[PDB]
Design a protein around this ligand. Sequence first.
Ligand code: YV3
Ligand code: ZN
Ligand code: ZN
Length: 232
Amino acid sequence: SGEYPTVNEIPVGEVRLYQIADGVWSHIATQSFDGAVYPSNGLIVRDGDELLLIDTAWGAKNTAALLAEIEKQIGLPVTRAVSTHFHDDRVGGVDVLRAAGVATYASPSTRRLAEAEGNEIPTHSLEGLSSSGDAVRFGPVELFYPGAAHSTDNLVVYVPSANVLYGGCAVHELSSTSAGNVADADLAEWPTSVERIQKHYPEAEVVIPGHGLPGGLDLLQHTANVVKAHKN
Ligand SMILES: C[C@@H](c1cccc2c(-c3ccc(CS(C)(=O)=O)c(F)c3)c(C(=O)O)[nH]c12)N1C(=O)CN(CCCCN)C1=O
Ligand SMILES: [Zn+2]
Ligand SMILES: [Zn+2]
């Protein structure tokens, strides 16, 4: 009823949307992995009379439900999707998207990692993102490669019309004490990568993590802190 959705308020097998700004929504879904349940976020950005999707809803059925929720709530066609790293919470559902006619994109790094992992593989490669600090435009967003963090391939997404920074899994929510699933992380580089985000997007007004509640710029420093404490 207006609060940011959580696993306790999303019915089984469903997806919820949350309005972030004019023409900007997050999507929230839940999934189980290794016998625990987790929420995860993605982004939807209006692109004229079409939509740009950032990240799947973590699974084929969740991603089908995401498409249905978008049709119900927004009613504009999703024409393109970008996955911000190779893990299943970002690419699981790309096959659903592709069969629905959505053009799916990721960096070449992400596409290689997804293929090697046995995860679903976005169709189109996003060049111009291979060095830390690189940025490219993609419809109504800027894509930015901050360096290795949660994963070596993680991208961040900025919506300049609204000053919305979608950090993806390189950014944690404020209530976190721990640094999430670090299996593929670079804990030593992660703070440097966060510093690059802070320097590039100093006017961000909303910061959205890959999992959990959006907030402000504090999520960036908080993430650096939790990562350093984990490494320690
Ligand atoms: C699919 C993905 C994955 C699964 C389960 C949980 C998470 C989490 C995660 C987020 C927040 C918290 C709460 S908190 C801040 O308080 O800790 C948490 F507890 C875990 C993250 C994330 O941090 O973004 N991602 C996860 N994922 C990986 O990321 C690495 N991996 C292993 C490789 C599998 C290859 N097929 C995996 O399955
Ligand atoms: Zn991940
Ligand atoms: Zn994640």
